[model samples]
Target: TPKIIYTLTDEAPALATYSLLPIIKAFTGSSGIAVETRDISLAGRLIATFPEYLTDTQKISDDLAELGKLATTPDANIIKLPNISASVPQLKAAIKELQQQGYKLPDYPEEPKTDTEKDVKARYDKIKGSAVNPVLREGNSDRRAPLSVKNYARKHPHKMGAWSADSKSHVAHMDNGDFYGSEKAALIGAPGSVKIELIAKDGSSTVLKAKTSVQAGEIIDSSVMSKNALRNFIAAEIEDAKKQGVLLSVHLKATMMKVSDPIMFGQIVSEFYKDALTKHAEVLKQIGFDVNNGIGDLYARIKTLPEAKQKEIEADIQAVYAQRPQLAMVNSDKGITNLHVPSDVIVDASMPAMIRDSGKMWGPDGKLHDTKAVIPDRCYAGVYQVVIEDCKQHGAFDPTTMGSVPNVGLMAQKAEEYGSHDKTFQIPADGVVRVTDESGKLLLEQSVEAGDIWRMCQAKDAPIQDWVKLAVNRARATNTPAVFWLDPARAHDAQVIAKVERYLKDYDTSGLDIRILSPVEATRFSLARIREGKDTISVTGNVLRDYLTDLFPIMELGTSAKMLSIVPLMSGGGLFETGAGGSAPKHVQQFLEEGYLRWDSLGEFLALAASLEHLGNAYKNPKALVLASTLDQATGKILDNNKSPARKVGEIDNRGSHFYLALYWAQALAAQTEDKELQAQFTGIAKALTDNETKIVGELAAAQGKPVDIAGYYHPNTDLTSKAMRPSATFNAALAPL
Candidate 1:
């Protein structure tokens, strides 16, 4: 499986915090999970408050009873009464049955027992002597009250500084003149005409007239109040505030009742404060606070306000808070109104729980950071944003030409192994099979002979856009061929399917014969959900039978051709056929004594021997001589008398040896033949490469008892000693067998 990298949102908690520690620990130790984080304080703040916010209101109530109690309670209650517990029905019935037609309850029946009653009676009589009136006034700030209304009005044109309009009615007034009557009269004066002038004290004026029918107090009348005009006024006020060097302070409260890490807490508070300030800066300016100048002055003013006035100010501040968590902050730090998260979190949400639950942080370095949510220079955006950026940088591949490979092209291998010819077959015995192609609706199905190299037009194109469509069309046109080979490779099925689906008009694909190619048994298992008969756009193939065709003939022919091209020693008189247990041939023995080949050269020898002896041997013949000669070559023995597993007739190389070259060749052949074995082999090799830190053959000479020459091995000076020569028939045939 490919590794998954996670980028956390800035709203996540710090790694060391109690809530996040366990998750971090789990992912760090996990396999194939790339964990990352950014130093986004907002993420930490969110992590700090996540538990509380994630919980339902009821769950929050259960977890922290004091939080709700502290916020809702008040000190004063105006009404008071004697404590009495009785059913309202009984009281209602008692009064109703007695008062059928004419009945009245005696007022004195519930009289008090002491002089306190007389005192209450006197107080009630005194209240009746006067009428109560409620007064609407400016905020209850003595400092503000002492200042003249003109000065206050001049300093702060709007009752509430640059902020949201108060949800509750606020105190504002036009000049102290009775224009209400004049305004009312003009509004209904004529059916098609009304004129008015906005006069300034300097004798300058702007006239506005609606030469159309108007209705009194009609909510739909645009002439009554123009929001555009109001906006212009606000803009002018904001410009003035900017010149005056006023500052606006936005206060945000933690909405959720949860424990938080201090680092994350500071980050969230600072970030939210910054964002809220940024989003509503214009509003702030309109109310006399200058965002350009900084919020220092406003913060100072807020600090100086009396408790009552401060509450009012807080209310005004929160009114304009943007509801979108990504764009704005919620109410003051008392409660969390919105929960903000980065786009990566949402994109990673659809991933498997192993990655999603790990909560690994992704950074802008194109890697998963161990901790933090700020993705460095990368801003949080949509999943498509990240994908598009990557695509733009790395480019895309043709889905049709993408053979069963994994990851990106740089890391994956072909699904099946390729060989010299006929022997080529897919690796895994029961693995996936697929068709490879380029963009086109018409598919060309060609029966490749042994030694034939598969080629498609896809490689010619710089960007393979229509490859998937081509593959689909070719596969659809194929007439149940038992074996097939696809060229090139692709890392992901999603990339292939994305292109393929563009040609599919319907979701139903029951008529298609598609299959996915997997590299390991686990690959098949992991894709169980995708293969469970669900309608999907991806391709997969179901096998109709196993080993329905013979590949040995092709392998034999290819083996012959290879031998003919590279070796010539078979025709030499030095070649000697030995009787059973015959003495070693003098020439072969001499060659072995001279160290003509190394131990690792066995497969090369067997390939040659197989070609030289294949045509001469009958189907049932033991053919032990041929096999024995190949094994001897592998063991660096020209004569087989001392080779392991000696047999009376002949010895043969095992099909499944631990030798790397044989296995590598087998995997290549399997890929060429659409066999499943290659998948398992490649997977095993990939895993070994990942886990063992094993160097390949070029670095294995020291372990194999060869003279050490690390620096010299890489030196270009070694190329000067090339002993290139045509091998004698026997030696050539033995080395280059098909």
Candidate 2:
């Protein structure tokens, strides 16, 4: 395996300006490799260096200032302003204008002089004094083969580059073998103690046993003998070993069994075991012996009687089986089961009685009345969905978010009697509302009737009480029906449903009618009326999807479980920095933190919004606030929305650092600012970024006088390099093409 090497860069003193050109030039000179340039600046210094540790007064001062700046400025405030949104493009435009003005740039920074003798000695002393282990250790390292570089070397190969793994120096020891020239041939035999033979490729052989046993462990001098003579000599010895029934040694085994087929190997084992009891059964039957022990003392009788008599009995038994197929029942060939098990009802396949003995069974109340229902394992219910039923004829209640029918009954049970009478609701207009539930089933079931006013009640003992409160408040504010899409599979458990209903009553839905949507029934009804435009709002409890930051992490999680696709904030670095971009509303934060919000791909995000609108997950009162960026100018105007920062920034110089930084930070941002190209071109800004990185790495290595440790092993401050590479919104924009 190839070893992975990680290189670290050393910290540097603060520079006068942010221009990476100087840093780029310095690094290009060091190590002859490019480095990634990172900016380590702050509003004020945070670290103070002891004068005793670093003698350089100028470097010490710069380090102290930078550290002090970082310490005083809280990250919370540092990123509050959209500096990248403003400065990057401005800088790029300014640069372009300056270029038009005919001003030429200066040469890049020069490399510093080599260390003085005293400085080098001081560094060496420090390295020797430190207890920390050095990055590279001296050892007998693996070497690669040497290759000749010139044509003359090729003709005289012996004097050319040595073979890879060749040892030039040799210590005198018995273990050390002498290297022989190609002209020498090894001698294999001596005068006559044992016979020797060889076999040729063509089934021909000869014997030379008289010259064998002369000297053990002597190499055969093949060149000294005729090829046919050598083959005959080896083959004869092999024939002698077989006749004596002698087992060859490990080395001899490999040499003798050079060629083999599967059948021949099996035959060998069989012949060796001919006298074994199992072998006797097969052999006796082959010779027509009465080997079958069908009746009392048959084996003893066979031993006492003649071999011919035993063979006769075995032959008779074989004939009987051949005539009657029923006598031989090969159970392995039949597919039969003693018992059948239900997949949905049983949790474990090994324990059949668990289903019958466990409390997961049902009761007369039409609810699963098992006490184990609350035991986590037995609490699971079947899939159910929320359907929006609102056809114009008996349109579901107006699709307003807040208090659709303040006086109406609960959303789940709007009927006068269970399974008796039900009314199909109607929707007056189209809108968007968000539906939330404990089960992931509702979202897929398409149960909730569109335009219909559903009833809802809260779960009295629901663990996530705060989440429930927020959901209700949001629903009321939006004027959408606040329906608790309960686990339909658990409906049979009156205790669970009753408790949930009580929770709903205490929910103070006075301003809003709470409804309990029978996700199961709703899903079925919605599907039936699909052509009639009936749709259901599907809400799932898969909150794990919302907290995932990157695609790789999400993919890892999804391998074992089903995932829900929620709109993702693509521009944000990850889930950790969701609200960092701005002061998002508490409800919005609530949605994000509680996992109610899920990050989604571009297509998924759009599809979700459309689904919610179609299913009436949005409404007027506390209206559905759909925040999205768009390239569609017409749509923006139709929605009466103002231009977002993304669009506003686009109007400025596109080749700014900030723009690129923003794009680099967010997948959504990058897609929005994508360039349509023909042959494609690399800009100076791109080159600068690449060059800056290269320079930083080199400087760090040079400053340390050695390669910094990196890769495989975790090290502090390494992530800082990655952070530094992120284009500041301003820098990225400035780098973008105008």
Candidate 3:
């Protein structure tokens, strides 16, 4: 049987599945096409990694690894919803929660010394960082606003925060001594494995990475940061923020760029409180005060100290703050600074949200204020600065008038920097990190210092070749301007540009408008077209792919979750990823407080329809084709009638939205004449849903305004979750016959 695997993920999306999946199963059951679910949630992934340590009932298959293998085959049809790419704090919390729930999971060793501890760390490490996507994304990305979604936005645009010409807002970044300025690159001359070795000034060599297999013509690069230089840059930015009277904030992808960004964040923290750190260095070391864990961790660690000692440390922090610029608050009421946690301000999401809010973030006074957004890396930081300057001169983007910025991203086999986890490291001391081939031929090298960040990245020949082809095809198909956002000055991009130029010659790009520009220039070019109501397609690498997909969608469509994200697998399969769920965690918290979930399953709706359509075409299933077509029409009607979940309680929440979708889908299926048996099956179901619409909504509403229990969080009790989510007996009865 043709099968579609719908992934069970984390937070709101996972909860929504409890209510939505049954409807999907009922609708597609008659077609003889099986719909299965694989647990790929953070908790599931964590448990799967240590099955040897688990009992029979608790054992889970490594579904993500299985899915990755499946994605490489032509039989693959997956609807992947957003899951938690957990940070350390989130991972620890999950472990603690699981321990309390009777799972004999070992605590994550902060400093692993013994062999057993190291083995446990290795297992936990597999579950951290961007663990899921790199394994499953055996393809390039094609993300854009769906036609129905675009039309809806055009008809009724969302609100845009106003931007003033005189807005005291700007992005600050290092022009030198950062990753971009210090990068080195080369094309692999032959197919062989390379080893990353660090050569110290004392004439000692330490192997950083044992092996990194490279193919012929692959682009390999290495880069480093100067700790002294970074500190100076940060200090200057703080002074400038004070001079401009703007909120001072730093943005980094600490969770994604786990090693480098957290170190950078710690540097910023230390620089901000240099006086305090220096004065209490011994006391902090004794208490295990690692700033890389953030200010919250620092305070948490100091709790065991005497009252006088703790008060002295607090006083020192206060004194440092008094001397420095005003810090941006994560939460003003809670007195949380932006530096409170490494994962609190992710650059990709945080920068876009700040830009959308007219270059402002919340300050200590509980009000919006212009911010000096410090993004130390010059790689994509300049892109945000370009947008900020453009907005300052022209004002905020008008959703009704502005056009969309779709993305053709290179993410196959994790082709770029985000995949450099094995190579990324925090510098132990002053040394030269070198990448050398098996014959001891040096490919790339960079100088570093104590506390500096250094890493190497590679883009294989085939994926780069494939990425260029995908970009050209998208340009031809859309008949829109396509810009490769690669910086010629950056060593890695230069190699990529050479390959892209070579690949373009193979394609017939005669009528298409394709160009190569730096990240800053490409961003400006895209913004210029966007303001003129002309669309532009951005061809970017993996990191920008993650950033721009969210950045442009939020500006043009009000929410990125409405965009259609498709990954065309290189081996002739499809991995249709639902939209970003960065906000899903908070939505789940709200659901726990008041029994109403605001998770909009529009992305799932779109992805599933696409999945079904692909399955129908691949297997020649007429019933599947009908289901796909009718489901699309149903989704359009749902959008047209504004049946999405509302924000307030006693209103149409996720459950209510599911009812409307089910009702509309049944109606569409019944109205279609192509599949008579399928139509007959759904005709009465449609009528019943329509006739009892008010009662169904009322029943869904009745469950709200009271706290409900779901038994667990990471791995919820399935029966309890379903009962809590599907409170509307009338709606349940309407679909029972289907």
Candidate 4:
């Protein structure tokens, strides 16, 4: 049997898997395909990380590590469902849940001093933000919406809010002292390991990162975001928003850029309530109130205090809100402000979401209003500003007419790696942070002030060559112009540009249209072409890959989750990613509240098709090919038939939607002549399903409109979940014969 690794993940997709996986497995097993599962859920990872602390029966294999090893082999075919790139709150909550469940997991040390606590923190850190991608993404990315998904969206366009000419909403980013201003980069001509050092004004040297191996002709860069400048910028932006009469909102990616962005976000949250926090500093310290955790935590922690003290601090917080401009809220009804949680106001999702709704966000009054969207780093923030400017002038993009901005992203080998937390630092003293080779030859250095954020990133040679080849091939295949969003003025981009140009010569780009342009200019060009209903392929670095996939797909397709994200591993295997839409934790929240799960499984279906296609081509499996084509046909049917889940509890939820997929898929298989055996097998199965369709759907609908306890949030009770997900007894009895 040809193996396809189906990953068990977290949140909505995780719940969907308990039902969806069985159906896929039942279908695939008949094709002599083994749908293997590797549990890489956030809870699973937590236990896997500290298996030494757990009892013998509690231990599980390191599935993520095993998959990483499999990812490099030619036989590997992975279906990566969306999982939590966990934040502090998420990680802490998972830890708490596991601990409560009798897992001997240690508490994640926030401020580690002892070696034991440090080890515990380090172990948890490995399980923290983006721990999975870099390990498995050993190839360049090819991400775009499938033809069916795009055409469906075009025909049935989701709402795109009108862009007014007098839009006050715009991106506010740093000009100086941020990463962009302080960045320095150069090519390392030789292969060797390097260490990051901090040299104090007194000439005392301290090593922050001991070593990182580099390749010949690798681009190594270093940059720092100044503390003082950041605080001042925050203050200025806040005050300006108050005067300008727009809702204040700051967006950052604290989840993935775990170290740098979270610390930066903490500063924003802390400084915004500086008055109340300062006045009640001792009280806060006593109550274990870490401003870095956000105001949500403050509310949670403040309850421990007496009613009078709690009221005093609450009143102070209220006073700050009155003094400042009205703030953007995550949920106005629940009083979840933008500052409530770092993960809530993710830049990629939040900014595009805001832009989609007339470049406006939710105000304290629960109404839409223009916002001063604070995106601190100048690096890619300008691109958002330019897009907003375009929207304001030309009006919101029409889904029916707008063209797609598919991405050929250089994301392999952890390319343009961010917040490899250990390599990033919040400086302790006034110093000059520098990167030096093993021989003590300095590569790049930048002077920094105390409390500033400094980070280092490297892009290796092999992946760069692979990335260029992929970009050229994609452009050649589509006959479309591909813009490499790299600025010559930017330190790192210049170094990457030099490599990109040289690498282009290796490919026969005789007629292909590929050019290097700054992000600002590239956005302008893409926006113009998109407005004219023309497609533009963006060839960008890892960071822009994440941003563009969400930005363009959200504008064009209404949701990024519909896009087909595939990583053709350089080692010859492939990793099929379901979508860029986050774990959609809110979907899970809704599921627990009401049995309705509105999380669309289209991405999963699309990703499975890609995975099967890859298996067919890579392994030369005829049955896999048959499965792939039928899956595609079924997915198209789902879109054409409008069989996706509804948000409200009464209609079809995720389970009912998957039922649609299975019925359509089985029918497609039964109709297809490519595989006579599959057709014959699914013919009877399809007949049974088609006969009981109404009854099965009613069974699924019956499970809705009630609370469900699947044991826990992160690590759910497998049997209980399967019971909840697979409520259609008739459907289960039909599949059981398979």
lDDT of each: 0.22, 0.23, 0.85, 0.87
lDDT of 1 by residue, 226-337 (tens): 1222223333432342343221111111111011111122233333345455654554444444221122224433555567755655564455333212211122242322
- Residue 462, model 2, lDDT: 23
Every candidate's CA RMSD: 40.0, 37.0, 1.9, 1.6
Model 1 TM-score (2 dp)? 0.16
- What RMSD does model 3 have? 1.9
| Candidate 2 residue lDDT tens string, 162-185 | 112221111111111111100122
TM-score of each: 0.16, 0.22, 0.96, 0.97
Tens-place lDDT per residue, model 4, 1-738, is 678999999888999898899989888888788888998888788777776777788788999999989989988789998887887774655455665555455465566779988877777777778888788888989899987798999998889999899988898988788888888997897888998889999889988987888888888888888988999999999999999999999888888888888888889987799998999989988867766667877898889899899999999899999999988999899999999876788888998899999999989988999999999998889999999999999999999999999999997888885535668899989989888897989889899889999988888889888999989998998889999999887898898998899989888988877898999999999999999999899999998998999999999888899889999899888899998777887898899889889888888899999989888887768989998899998999999988988778888898787998999999999998998999998898889889999999998899898999987788777889999989999999999895
Clashing pairs in 4: none
Worst 10 residues of 1 by lDDT: 133-142
Q: What lDDT score goes with residue 687 in model 4? A: 91
Model 3 agreement with the true structure over 66-153: per-residue lDDT tens digits: 9988988988889999877776663544554565466555455556778988988777776777788788898898898987898888
